[PDB]
A paper describes a structure:
Infectivity, gliding motility and adhesion of these mycoplasmas to host cells are mediated by orthologous adhesin proteins forming a transmembrane adhesion complex that binds to sialylated oligosaccharides human cell ligands. The main and most abundant surface structure is the adhesion complex, also known as the Nap complex, which comprises the transmembrane adhesin proteins P40/P90 and P1. Adhesins play an essential role in attachment to surfaces by binding to the SOs ligands also allowing mycoplasmas to glide across these surfaces. The Nap complexes were proposed to cycle between “open” and “closed” conformations where the SOs binding pockets become accessible or inaccessible, respectively.
The structure of the ectodomain of P1 bound to the Fab fragment of P1/MCA4 was determined by cryo-EM single particle analysis with an overall resolution in the final map of 2.4 Å. The high quality of the map allowed accurate modelling of the structure from P1 and the Fab variable domains, defining clearly the paratope-epitope interface. The Fab constant domains were less well defined, indicating some flexibility in the Fab elbow. The sequence observed for the Fab corresponded to the one with light chain L1. The structure of P1 consists of a large N-terminal domain (residues 60-1399) and a smaller C-domain (1400-1521), in full agreement with the structures of P1 reported previously. The structure of the P1-Fab complex shows that the epitope of P1/MCA4 is conformational, although involving residues from the C-domain only, in particular from loop Val1425-Asp1438 in agreement with the epitope mapping analysis. Importantly, superposing the structure of P1-Fab(P1/MCA4) onto the Nap complex in “open” conformation available for M. genitalium results in a catastrophic steric clash of the Fab against the adhesins, indicating that the epitope of P1/MCA4 is totally inaccessible to antibodies in the “open” conformation of the Nap complex. At this stage the C-domain of P1 has completed a hinge rotation of about 175º with respect to the “open” conformation, allowing the epitope of antibody P1/MCA4 to be fully exposed. Binding of antibody P1/MCA4 to the C-domain of P1 traps the Nap complex in the “closed” conformation, which explains why only moving cells are affected by the antibody. In the presence of P1/MCA4, gliding mycoplasma cells rapidly reduce their speed and eventually halt and detach from sialylated glass surfaces, while non-moving cells are not affected by the presence of P1/MCA4 and remain attached to surfaces.
Numbering used by the authors:
A (entry chain L): -1 to 216
B (entry chain 1): 60 to 103, 107 to 223, 229 to 263, 268 to 336, 349 to 831, 847 to 871, 888 to 924, 928 to 1067, ...
C (entry chain H): -5 to 216
Write the structure that this text describes.
């Protein structure tokens, strides 16, 4: 089957209806009748724990808050209440068809008020240049949701080589996302250019946040 | 039984279906095989064929079967249903089909119900059930359906009467409707405002002494006696008022009559081959059953047919809207019937004269009589009442043989409901019949499948929810319906294919007829013959034809509004020659003086009012106000003029399959869907009436979740892309490589003026002063009528009203033919005094002072709808017919030795056109609306192309009549036989859908998942520069060549065509009543005096200053004999093919052609960079110029293959079109093997060495000591890899990792293990692909049952 | 309860065949089938295969049929996965999970997870680079500071701010790949008066090379 599990990231608050959809090209009803659609929850830094087995039946030791339902190619896991333990990525998994394919993943994220990323420029330091390398970074912090595009521009001209993406899991303290963007450059490449900027484009603000710096000790 | 070698694969012409690929647990192909050597119905005196005897003869002679193919393409057993002796599969207690993977389906020993009367039918479509891979919906049609094209049942033309003084053609019944002297008192009486100032307003109702501003008071009232002894009674009905009647043509009143087509029993009226009752009676013999074929090729009981489920056409006509029982009627009721009848125009929304295919009488009910409503009564008050059941019944919209079996095909499963969306119609399409899928049949099965219910809902029902926001393409399209479902969408259905989960019903569709939306004036019928023939169902051109001078200002005026009590020619300001110049400004004073005094009174007090507002407008205005244009509100079509004969738009529809599976079987309609039983109820009726309780017809509105008509573009941007679209006839683009703003025809054999694009054509007029108001610096397009400024050298950005209406000279002009006078309104303290003459002082002239300087078909004014002629309806029609290459072009030069259109006869550069715009031979009347007819002439015949290059052109074209000659022109399709029904099987390539429309593989690229800023469509046309592809394009039956449009493993759409029919037709044309040409449309001679292009007897010398006035067509104004020959598109095709050269490379004249779509880049169709000051029209136009070949030779555009990678619209590359020598009657398309007529090398599911160990080879004791369930995983259903070698022969060459053993049937009690040996076929061959059964594992197949025997 | 203890986070060079144990307790190993699943860091789970330990019978998916080999040892009730010729895409967390077939429970009780990375990188000491803003954060009332750890291996690294005393606004980041190497970048948000007056030092502890770097970030004359 062509495995599709929507949404990739489901925004839901505490104690709301978190419906995770798993959709199929054709029905995954097994030969023995029992449709092997299983919903697993993977807490951050934890093993994927099964919650829903055989489409609808609830796993042992699993709260009633989870309930799978569907037939044929449609399978929705509905969560009546979303607690802190519900935090994690949700996988729909078909076992009636080989290969046993897991869903793309659905990270239940606490839905807080959308915030703009706290983009902060950080020039490479002298000890990095003396080592023969130069990695300019700029830190993003406290933004919601995760779908934010970050663009790197050298002296105004956009570049994509050396673009590095690094994010953070939703913290338990205040449920914020943080993003680290780094450009890997050699020494000669770094000393050959004047100004740099990152152009993190978040839906919170109409215009992308403009954060720039210059290497002439501005 | 086993193979039948005398049967070869064949393609169902209705759906382009030849084989159903089968990927999964039941793999292979379900191919349609037939005795392709059988002549069919005695074909290879035009005698009629009795349907019963023809069916018996075809059963006795033609042989049809379902050939099962294993996954590798090896031809397994045939399923010859006539020779088959099937058995209903047994079922267990849970209702599932008793089916062992090796014993097959448990056969009950009894054939399916009414099988003996069904066996002789024909498999023409297979749909595998996703819920059950072994379950298939096999569509059965009578053998006669398959060979209906051989019956040559052409649509009959009306008989003449014989010499005619009207100059009509093809039996056209045209005569200027005359004022009824007896019914002269029935002229609508103007009603003055009941409050507030005399003046000298002789232009608002005051004939000579009234002088008041009077609106025509339409009073339709009940009688005072409210008792129901004679039910509701009428004492006044101004809708019944018919002061203009059908003229007495030589004593007999010229009238649309069924007997015009002849008497059913040498003009033969086109009846359907079988009535809908004739199919409902003897459903097994004559309907398209849906046999549920349970198929397991490698099991002992391979075949099991459970249900038959005749697709009863009455099961669909039962769900027809009640208004469809009276289709010569519409919710405009009696006034509209009378208006169209006296105009010699088909009445109602679906007239059998326009669409005989959906009427059991066909052309024997094809008239405006017997509408199910009282029309011809001595008392006008009694007219318009619904005729009782005991009275003479009307001819309902039905589903007769042609229409039914056009609506038969493209089976699409969903859950327990199989939806037969219908075919493209070609299985029952004649040259001039347009049988189409009127709706979706549905065999809804229960969970068990034992019992099924067959229903059918018209596409009007499913599309009632259509709105503008449901399309990313053209808005205001004539797709809107009303509660009566007057809009009858009938689709040449490509198929209902699933891009994932959204049910894409694509193909082409008949939108609401816009061509006859503008009703002609009663005394202008004999002038605008083409619009008369379109109106009366003769000219089956759905395309809006530019005949605008003879239009009424509006089509919604009842006949009472047509004649004024004065001696004026028409009843202006309510009813006069359409002239947007003469329209009233919707300013506060004019609206409050002409509309407001009666806008509140409209409808109230049983009296509507026709305002003294001069409601005039061009093609786009007529379409906007009186076509069923799509609005933001579903079912909001207050005005469905009629329906398109043939499909008039490209179409695709994201339907909700969940609704379609769950939609009601018997559709319950309320009184709102019924036409009002009387004229009073119709008068006081509301367009949007809430559905009655207990009715489910409104549940079908959400069926069409979304739709598209090809390109996801605004109208004018679509026009630009259409101008980039090559005309497939010669491959030359409709824009004629016009460089837009970069062309030399802007004010500053390579490039010419463009057909549908106005960009770079005419002048860059600022519309600020135009109609009193971004800046919107719009291109006038060709046919510009810009007034010269007082300076003289600078043309103004508009047309002065005095110039356009002839009041600069202050008699019998084309500007004010109805003697309209300038009207002004002075607001002297809420006393809105209307007065004749110019505005002067503080009075506000009712007329627009500055008008859009283009009244021609090229008129594209987004700032001014009333002057716009390019409308989204016409743009969709032009797009469809340009893909077909069948857009009519008006020509008055036949291309003969004398009537030759030379290159010097035509000019394109603004340098030549500014001094003399007649050099650009734009008809501005008669030609197809929304295009530049000289540009279409150049695109088709390339007169200027060949003149500049060196003259091989056909010489066909329109030339402006000079001196005193009259352009006795006619529209001609350029000879291309592609029909809007030439719609191939729908296929899914990734997120896109694709089907061959005509010679163009249409790819809806961002329809299912719309992408912002994309064109919405990749067009892949046959390369006419290639001789083979050109011959395929120029085939009299070019769709008979089409075989399939399968999406290959690379995601590209390979459309295989059978060129053997093309070559046979070419040979019969080289060796040898409307002509039997599919695009032979009964065009009429558009006669325009040269004086119509010389309006000057000062500041506007443009020939197109006024609407081009035609002359009253007479017998002297007939077509030229060679021009009349051009009305046979075979003649235009012959001329164009002579122009194309005769290289005719018979090396070895390939009998088939697989046209694979180009690899479209991510930028193919993308405007995101293009759109990101300049208008989107200009940006897209310049982008298409950037894709034109930067810069004749046998008058065929060389396939430079530029822009196909960026625009997505282009012709087939030479590599993209592979010429295969073998003929292709049909295609067998297994997931691995593509076989042309089943021949060719069968695919390899894996090496022949890997084989199941024979029972003796495996020990049977150690293998079956431990339980069978422990010897494999009971969930993967796979034998453990440690046990695969001990079941099958694994050679050292073959990696055991490549092999899995799918467990099919485990029985621990008997201890039998039954496995499907599956080899891993890598996709494109890391370790990704598909585990596909190894059919070479055993002689039986990929499955083997190891049991202790 | 049914308990699964796989092998610990295993460091392996490409092309080296290593075995991931899966200790099973609380149930009969033979009865219920041990499935192995791959979860590449940041992407979805991928069912490597299953092995019935009663007969040791393996059924892999073809995406892992030739890459990983499943074996079981019934004497110690341990499942195994010999990943043959580990390559870059075979850098993931590998889960063993017992599966019931009486109740149609595919997997359910999964092992803690064996995080396997195949980068052919030595135990490179963490190169800590102080990160200080020029004037963007100084003008802002909420000054952000950072510390970039370049050239280190493997994933386990203890990066804290001021020996854990400074924890408010701390946003540590996981490392990424560039030319077969790992690099993270820790962040912290402190009030304007805190920097540069207060000593903001990032303590990077790498529990693989005994390299503890207490890097104090300083303004470089800007």
């Amino acid at each position: 089957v062509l495995m599709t599990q929507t949404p990739l990231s489901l925004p839901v608050s505490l104690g709301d209806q978190a419906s995770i959809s798993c959709r199929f090209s054709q029905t995954i009803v097994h030969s023995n009748g029992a449709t092997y659609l299983e919903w697993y929850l993977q807490r951050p830094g934890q093993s994927p724990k099964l919650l829903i087995y055989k489409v609808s039946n609830r796993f042992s030791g699993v709260p009633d808050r989870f309930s799978g339902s569907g037939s044929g190619t449609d399978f929705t896991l509905k969560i009546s209440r979303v607690e802190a333990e519900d935090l994690g990525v949700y996988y729909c998994f078909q076992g009636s068809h080989v290969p046993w394919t897991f869903g793309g993943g659905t990270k239940l994220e606490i839905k807080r008020a959308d915030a703009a990323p706290t983009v902060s420029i950080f020039p490479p330091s002298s000890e990095q240049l003396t080592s023969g390398g130069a990695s300019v970074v700029c830190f993003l912090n406290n933004f919601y949701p995760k779908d934010i595009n970050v663009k790197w521009k050298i002296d105004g001209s956009e570049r994509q080589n050396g673009v590095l993406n690094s994010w953070t899991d939703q913290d338990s303290k205040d449920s914020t996302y943080s993003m680290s963007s780094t450009l890997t450059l050699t020494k000669d490449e770094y000393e050959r250019h004047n100004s740099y900027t990152c152009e993190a484009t978040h839906k919170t603000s109409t215009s992308p946040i403009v954060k720039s710096f210059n290497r002439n000790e501005c | 039984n086993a193979i039948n070698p005398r049967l070869t694969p064949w393609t169902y012409r209705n759906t382009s279906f030849s084989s159903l690929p089968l990927t999964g647990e039941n793999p292979g192909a379900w191919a349609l095989v037939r005795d392709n050597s059988a002549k069919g119905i005695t074909a290879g005196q035009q005698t009629t064929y009795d349907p019963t005897r023809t069916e018996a003869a075809l059963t006795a002679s033609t042989t049809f079967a379902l050939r099962r193919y294993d996954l590798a393409g090896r031809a397994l057993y045939d399923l010859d249903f006539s020779k088959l002796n099937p058995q209903t599969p047994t079922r267990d207690q849970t209702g599932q089909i008793t089916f062992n993977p090796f014993g097959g389906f448990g056969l009950s020993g009894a054939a399916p119900q009414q099988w003996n009367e069904v066996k002789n039918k024909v498999p023409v479509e297979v749909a595998q059930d996703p819920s059950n891979p072994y379950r298939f919906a096999v569509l059965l049609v009578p053998r006669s359906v398959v060979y209906y094209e051989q019956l040559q049942r052409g649509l009959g033309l009306p008989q003449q009467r014989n010499t005619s003084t009207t100059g009509a053609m093809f039996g056209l019944k045209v005569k200027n409707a005359e004022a009824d002297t007896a019914k002269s008192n029935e002229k609508l009486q103007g009603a003055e405002a009941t409050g507030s100032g005399s003046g000298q307003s002789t232009q608002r109702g005051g004939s000579s002494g009234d002088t008041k501003v009077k609106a025509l008071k339409i009073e339709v009232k009940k009688k005072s006696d409210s008792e129901d002894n004679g039910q509701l009674q009428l004492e006044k009905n101004d809708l019944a008022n018919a002061p203009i009647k059908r003229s007495e043509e030589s004593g007999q009143s010229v009238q649309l009559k069924a007997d015009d087509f002849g008497t059913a029993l040498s003009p033969t009226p086109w009846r359907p081959w079988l009535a809908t009752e004739q199919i409902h009676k003897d459903l097994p013999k004559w309907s398209a059953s849906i046999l549920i074929l349970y198929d397991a090729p490698y099991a002992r009981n391979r075949t099991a047919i459970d249900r038959v489920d005749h697709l009863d056409p009455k099961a669909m006509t039962a769900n027809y809207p009640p208004s469809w029982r009276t289709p010569k009627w519409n919710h405009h009721g009696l006034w509209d019937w009378k208006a169209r009848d006296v105009l010699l125009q088909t009445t109602g929304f679906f007239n059998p004269r326009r669409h005989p295919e959906w009427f059991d009488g066909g052309q024997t009910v094809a008239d405006n009589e017997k509408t199910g409503f009282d029309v011809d009564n001595s008392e006008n008050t009694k007219q318009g009442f619904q005729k009782e059941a005991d009275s003479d019944k009307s001819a309902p919209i039905a589903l007769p043989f042609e229409a039914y079996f056009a609506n038969i095909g493209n089976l699409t499963w969903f859950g327990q409901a199989l939806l037969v969306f219908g075919g493209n119609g070609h299985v029952t399409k004649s040259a001039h019949t347009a049988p189409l899928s009127i709706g979706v049949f549905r065999v809804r099965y229960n969970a068990t499948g034992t019992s099924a219910t067959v229903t059918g809902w018209p596409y009007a029902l499913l599309f009632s929810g259509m709105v503008n926001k449901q399309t990313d393409g053209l808005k205001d399209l004539p797709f809107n319906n009303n509660r009566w479902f007057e809009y009858v969408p009938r689709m040449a259905v490509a198929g209902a294919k699933f891009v994932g989960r959204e049910l894409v019903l694509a193909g082409t569709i008949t939108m609401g007829d816009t061509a006859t939306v503008p009703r002609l004036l009663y005394d202008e019928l004999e002038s605008n013959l083409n619009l008369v023939a379109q109106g009366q169902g003769l000219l089956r051109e759905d395309l809006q034809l530019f005949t605008p001078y003879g239009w009424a200002n509006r089509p919604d005026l009842p006949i009472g509004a047509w004649s004024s009590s004065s001696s004026s020619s028409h009843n202006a300001p309510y009813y006069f020659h359409n002239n947007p110049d003469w329209q009233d400004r919707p300013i506060q004073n004019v609206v409050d003086a002409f509309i407001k005094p009666w806008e509140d009174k409209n409808g109230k007090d049983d009296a509507k009012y026709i305002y003294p507002y001069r409601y005039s407008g061009m093609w786009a205005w007529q379409v906007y106000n009186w076509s069923n244009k799509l609005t933001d509100q579903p079912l909001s079509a207050d005005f469905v003029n009629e329906n398109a004969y043939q499909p008039n738009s490209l179409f695709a529809a994201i339907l909700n399959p969940e609704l379609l599976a769950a939609l009601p079987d018997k559709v319950k309609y309320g009184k709102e869907n019924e036409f009002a039983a009387n004229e009073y109820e119709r008068f006081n009726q509301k367009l949007t009436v809430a559905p009655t309780q207990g009715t489910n017809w409104s549940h079908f509105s959400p069926t069409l979740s979304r739709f598209s008509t090809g390109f996801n573009l605004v109208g004018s941007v679509l026009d630009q892309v259409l101008d980039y679209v090559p005309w497939i006839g010669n491959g030359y683009r409709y824009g004629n490589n016009h460089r837009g703003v970069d062309d030399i025809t802007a004010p500053q054999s390579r490039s010419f003026l463009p057909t549908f694009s106005n960009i770079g054509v005419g002048l860059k007029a600022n519309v600020q002063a135009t109609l009193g108001g971004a800046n919107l610096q719009l291109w006038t397009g060709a046919g510009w009528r810009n007034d010269k400024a007082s300076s003289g050298q600078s043309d103004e950005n508009h047309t002065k009203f005095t110039s356009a209406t002839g009041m600069d000279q202050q008699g019998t002009s084309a500007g004010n033919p109805d003697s309209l006078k300038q009207d002004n309104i002075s607001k002297s303290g809420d006393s809105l005094t209307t007065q004749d003459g110019n505005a002067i002082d503080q009075q506000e002239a009712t007329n627009y002072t500055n008008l859009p300087p283009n009244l021609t078909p090229t008129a594209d004014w987004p700032n001014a709808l009333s002057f716009t002629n390019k409308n989204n309806a016409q743009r969709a029609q032009l797009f469809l017919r340009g893909l077909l290459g069948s857009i009519p072009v008006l020509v008055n030069r036949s291309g003969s030795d004398s009537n030759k259109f030379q290159a010097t006869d035509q000019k394109w550069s603004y340098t030549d056109l500014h001094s003399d715009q007649t050099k650009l031979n734009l008809p501005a009347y008669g030609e197809v609306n929304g295009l530049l007819n000289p540009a279409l002439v150049e695109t088709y015949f390339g007169n200027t192309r060949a003149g500049g290059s060196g003259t091989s052109s056909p010489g066909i074209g329109f030339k402006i009549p000079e001196q005193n000659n009259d352009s006795k022109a006619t529209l001609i399709t350029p000879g291309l036989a592609w029909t809007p029904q030439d719609v191939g099987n729908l296929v899914v390539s990734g997120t896109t859908v694709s089907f061959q429309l005509g010679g163009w593989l249409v790819t809806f690229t961002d329809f299912v998942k719309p992408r912002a800023g994309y064109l919405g469509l990749q067009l892949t046309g046959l390369d006419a520069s290639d001789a083979t592809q050109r011959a395929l394009i120029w085939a009299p039956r070019p769709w008979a060549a089409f075989r399939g449009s399968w999406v290959n493993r690379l995601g590209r759409v390979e459309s295989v065509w059978d060129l053997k029919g093309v070559w046979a037709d070419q040979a019969q044309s080289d060796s040898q009543a409307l002509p039997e040409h599919p695009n032979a449309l009964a065009f009429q001679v558009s006669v325009v005096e040269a004086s119509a292009y010389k309006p000057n007897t000062s500041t506007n010398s443009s020939p197109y200053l006024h609407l081009v006035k035609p002359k009253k067509v007479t017998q002297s104004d007939k077509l030229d004999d060679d021009l009349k020959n051009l009305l046979d598109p075979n003649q235009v095709r012959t001329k164009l093919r002579q122009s194309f050269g005769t290289d005719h490379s018979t090396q070895p004249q390939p009998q088939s052609l697989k046209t694979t779509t180009p690899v479209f880049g991510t930028s193919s169709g993308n405007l995101s960079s293009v759109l990101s000051d300049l208008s989107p029209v200009e940006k897209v136009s310049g982008w298409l110029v950037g894709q034109l070949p930067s810069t004749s030779t046998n008058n065929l555009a060389p396939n430079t293959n530029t822009g196909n990678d960026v625009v997505g619209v282009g012709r087939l590359s030479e590599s993209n079109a592979a010429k295969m020598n073998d003929d292709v009657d049909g295609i067998v398309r297994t997931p691995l093997a593509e076989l042309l007529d089943g021949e060719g090398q069968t695919a390899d599911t894996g090496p022949q060495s890997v084989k199941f160990k024979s029972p003796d080879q495996i020990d049977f004791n150690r293998l079956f000591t431990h339980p069978v369930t422990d010897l494999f995983d009971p969930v993967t259903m796979l034998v453990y890899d440690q046990y695969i070698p001990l079941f099958i022969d694994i050679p050292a060459s073959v990696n055991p990792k490549m092999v899995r053993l799918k467990v099919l049937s485990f029985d621990t009690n008997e201890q039998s293990l039954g496995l499907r040996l599956e080899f891993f076929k890598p996709d494109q061959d890391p370790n990704n692909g598909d585990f596909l059964p190894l059919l070479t594992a055993s002689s039986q197949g990929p499955q083997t049952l190891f049991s202790p025997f | 309860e049914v308990q699964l203890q796989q092998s610990g986070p295993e460091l392996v060079k490409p092309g080296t065949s290593m075995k991931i144990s899966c200790k099973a307790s609380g149930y009969s190993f033979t009865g219920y089938t041990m499935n192995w699943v791959k979860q590449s860091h940041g992407k979805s789970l991928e069912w490597i295969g299953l092995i019935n330990p009663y007969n040791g019978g393996t059924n892999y998916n073809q995406k892992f049929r030739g890459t990983a080999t499943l074996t079981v040892d019934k004497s110690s009730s341990t499942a195994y996965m010999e990943l043959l010729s580990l390559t870059s895409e075979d850098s993931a967390v590998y889960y063993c999970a017992r599966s019931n077939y009486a109740y149609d429970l595919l997997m359910d009780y999964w092992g803690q997870g064996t995080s396997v990375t195949v980068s052919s990188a030595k135990t490179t000491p963490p190169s800590v680079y102080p990160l200080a803003p020029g004037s963007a954060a100084q003008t802002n009332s909420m000054v952000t500071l950072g510390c970039l750890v370049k050239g280190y291996f493997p994933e386990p690294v203890t990066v804290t701010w001021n020996s854990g005393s400074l924890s408010s606004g701390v946003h540590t980041f996981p490392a990424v790949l560039q030319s077969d190497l790992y690099t993270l970048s820790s962040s912290v948000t402190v009030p304007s008066s805190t920097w540069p007056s207060e000593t903001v030092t990032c303590n990077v502890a790498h529990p693989a090379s005994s390299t503890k770097v207490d890097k104090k970030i300083v303004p470089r004359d800007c």
